[PDB]
Amino acid sequence: GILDTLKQFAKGVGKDLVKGAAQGVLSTVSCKLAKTC
Numbered sequence: 504g505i506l507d508t509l510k511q512f513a514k515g516v517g518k519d520l521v522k523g524a525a526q527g528v529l530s531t532v533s534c535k536l537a538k539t540c
Contacts, residue, residue: 527533527540534540 524532531540
């Protein structure tokens with residue numbers, strides 16, 4: 504349903520964030536003075 508629909512994309516504009524967190528990691532996170540990575 505609609506309540507699964509928004510959840511699907513949310514659990515994907517959340518994977519992209521987990522992917523964004525899972526980018527460097529230490530290089531990005533440490534590099535993340537003002538997100539210069």
